[model samples]
Target: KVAELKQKIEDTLCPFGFEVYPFQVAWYNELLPPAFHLPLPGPTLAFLVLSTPAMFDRALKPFLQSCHLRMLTDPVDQCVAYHLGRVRESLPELQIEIIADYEVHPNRRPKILAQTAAHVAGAAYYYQRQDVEADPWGNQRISGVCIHPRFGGWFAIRGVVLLPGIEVPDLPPRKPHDCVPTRADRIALLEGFNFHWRDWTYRDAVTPQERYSEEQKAYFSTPPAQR
Candidate 1:
């Protein structure tokens, strides 16, 4: 049953350049504190969804053409919401819950720690300051970053889909591919992501099979007010 759902989800989204990775809720909650845990039983099945570099061209472009853009919302966010909504609609028999990466609680904490979910799902290896051997940046807070084995930093974790009441107690965990394995490389990757994110060097920490096109870059570069 889980395999069927996984295949259905992949069939629906993969054509639009999105990737789905199945995981159990316990695996994610095990790595997070209670405050961050999903309000559900531990063994419930979940899937992490990501939009690759190709999503800009394959999904967003068509979405822009077909849908009326909401005046107050981000188009990319709307696009992802639309697709995820469709996924729920397709499986109407199940009360699937969708949590987007951008959704926040009343206190403003993100509903999901997307990178952590991605890491636990084996979709991407999250590289944090602790992963560094001799942390060079003292007294400064550094944010963790996830690197996809194939796309590096060129992918966005869109959201997660949860199957309520469905348990996967025996689901085997898979380790994410550690693309930046060496200490020096990990340090460099973190530094590049923190200090020079705008330059996009961190995204190329690993050779990517594809990258955001100039058009996509332009769309992101322009501020929302101006766009």
Candidate 2:
């Protein structure tokens, strides 16, 4: 049943350059603090959704062409919401709760920690300061970053789809591949992400099979207010 459901989700979203990865809710909850824990059964099934570089052309452009751009809402967010809504509609029998990456509580806590979800789902390896062997930055805070094995940093973790009643006790956990394996490379990857994220050099921490196109780059480079 789990396999079939995953296939159904992939059929619905994959053509638009979206990827879905399954993980037991327990796996995710184990890594997070109680505050960040999802209020779901430990054995419940969930999926992490990602948008590849192709999503810009494959999904967003078509979405923009057909849909009327609403005032005050980000187009990219709207585009993702439209597609995820379709996913929900496709699986009407199940109560699928969609938490987008940008959704937040009134107090500003993110509804989901997207990077953590991606890591536990085995879709991407999350590199943090703790992952580094010998710390170079003393006491200076450095944020973590997720690198997709194939896309490197080019892909975005859009959200998570949670199945409320479904449980998969037999589901096995898979670790995300450590793409940035070496100590030196890890240091460079962190530096690139922290110091020069605007240049997108951090995304090249590993050789990517695909990357954001120039048109996509231009669209992102323009401020959201202008776009």
Candidate 3:
């Protein structure tokens, strides 16, 4: 019974449609470890590791930069573009599915949890995981999270400094859910966050300003060197 519910929990958060994460045990036929590439770190560890985008990026970044057709073997700029395949394959079936959904839909999908009652600000961690922001103003301020980029957002030496001392009542977590998570949840896990449509306004918009006269797509897509 407990195992069944546990699978449910993993599935809900795993993908747009409650699909399994590349790390969870509910993967069709496979389990973690000897049969897979992971070191068999148990359910808790697996969940903890893959709970966020930052951690996911950290687990990846290296591999993509090292070996990938997208960026190829660029020596100076090794920042390779990573796909979801590497992350999924590294784990069991559950995490594999979740990552696939996440990567396939880079626009952030599905809200499984609320606006972090678990951690301080945006960064998620339990216990005294330490908040990484200025003590006085903290993370609530967009400036704090904006300036420095952490794994997914910004970071601190300690953990994550919250947005502010003021705690809003049940602020929604900002993950996108326009599409499916490969597997959708039959039973809603938690309350839904205020989901939004895919924002591509600027994607096709133009700059009327004389100084910024360039194709919308080409303008934004230009290399940093030209910018």
Candidate 4:
């Protein structure tokens, strides 16, 4: 039943050029604080993957006649959420909690858990979360986010659903860390987003090291290439 649920979710996402991954909480529990760990449930997993501009535009449809801006990226999240919700409803016997990039946790669980879940789901390695130098513009931070091997800076993690006492299938293989923003346009856009999301944190413009885990250092050696 668990395997079937995984496939059903995967099949729904394939047409949209997305993939789902399941994982145990043990894979990334260490990254969370004890306070969050106690109240937050475990054995959760995510159904996410890198997305493309075409996918986004198609999924978003009439709302996005042009790709002027990020446009909230919520439309894609909704599409995934709708599909996953159906899967959840289909398998009512399966007790699980679902969350998307658009949902909020009043418990204040570290948002970086999305990245950790991506890693545990077999995404090779998550992005650098606290390297002040990861940005080409300099003095900017791109910490606490996950990057796709193929999407470079053009992807999003739709949502992560928590599965309690459920059996997860073998995780997909790890993705390569070779991809990063190399194009002039790509580099500039990512840098711009770094600042936007900084403000998006709902605080004044200040570097957020509160959840800094130094996992970013692992990929700092490989500088992004310019196209």
Best model number under lDDT: 2
Q: List, residue by residue over 1-227, the lDDT tens digit for candidate 2.
A: 88899998999999998999999989889998999999999999999999999999899999899746798999999999888998998898898999999999999999999999999999999999999877879988798899999999999999999998999988888899999999898888999998888898999887999999988998998999999
Q: Quote the lDDT for 67 in model 1.
A: 49
> What lDDT tens digits, residue by residue, belong to model 4 across residues 1-227?
54676787766565665567666565556666665352343544444443443444344453335343243344445565665576577557777676665566677544435666676676524545333344555554455455545443344566666666653445443443533334443443344456564322311112222221133222222332310
The ten-residue window of minimal lDDT in model 3 covers 185-194
What CA RMSD would you report for each candidate?
1.1, 1.0, 18.7, 12.0
Model 1 scores a C-alpha lDDT of 0.91
Q: Would you list the rank order by TM-score, best first?
A: 2, 1, 4, 3
Structure candidate 2, residue pairs in collision: none
Q: In candidate 2, what residue range of length 10 has the lowest lDDT sum?
A: 62-71
- Taking all chains together, the TM-score of candidate 4 against the true structure is 0.57
Tens-place lDDT per residue, model 3, 118-170, is 22222222111123222332343211111011222121111111111222333
* Candidate ordering by lDDT (highest first): 2, 1, 4, 3
Model 4 off-target regions past 4 Å? Answer: 1-3, 36-50, 62-77, 106-112, 129-142, 168-227
lDDT of 1 by residue, 1-227 (tens): 88899988988899998999999999899999999999989889999999998888888989888746888788888899999998898787899999999899999989999999999999999999999877888999799999998988988999999999999989899999999999899988898888898887899988999988888878887887776
Mark the 10 consecutive residues where model 1 has the least summed lDDT. 66-75
- Cα-based TM-score, every candidate: 0.96, 0.97, 0.22, 0.57
